[PDB]
Homo-oligomer: A and B are copies of this chain.
Amino acid sequence: KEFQVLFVLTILTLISGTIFYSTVEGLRPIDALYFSVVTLTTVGETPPPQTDFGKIFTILYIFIGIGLVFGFIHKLAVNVQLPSILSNLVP
- A35-64 at interface with B (beta carbon < 8 Å): 37-39, 41-48, 52, 55-56, 58-59, 62-64
Contact A67 B59 (CB under 8 A): no
| Contact yes or no, A55 B34, CB < 8 A | yes
**A binding-site residues for B, Cβ under 8 Å:** 5, 9, 30-31, 33-34, 37-39, 41-48, 52, 55-56, 58-59, 62-64, 66-68, 71-74, 76-77, 81, 85, 89
A-B contacts, 29 listed (Cβ < 8 Å): A5-B89, A9-B85, A30-B52, A30-B56, A33-B59, A34-B48, A34-B55, A37-B59, A37-B63, A38-B45, A38-B48, A39-B45, A41-B42, A41-B62, A41-B63, A43-B44, A43-B62, A44-B45, A45-B45, A45-B46, A45-B48, A46-B47, A63-B72, A64-B81, A66-B73, A67-B73, A67-B76, A67-B77, A68-B77
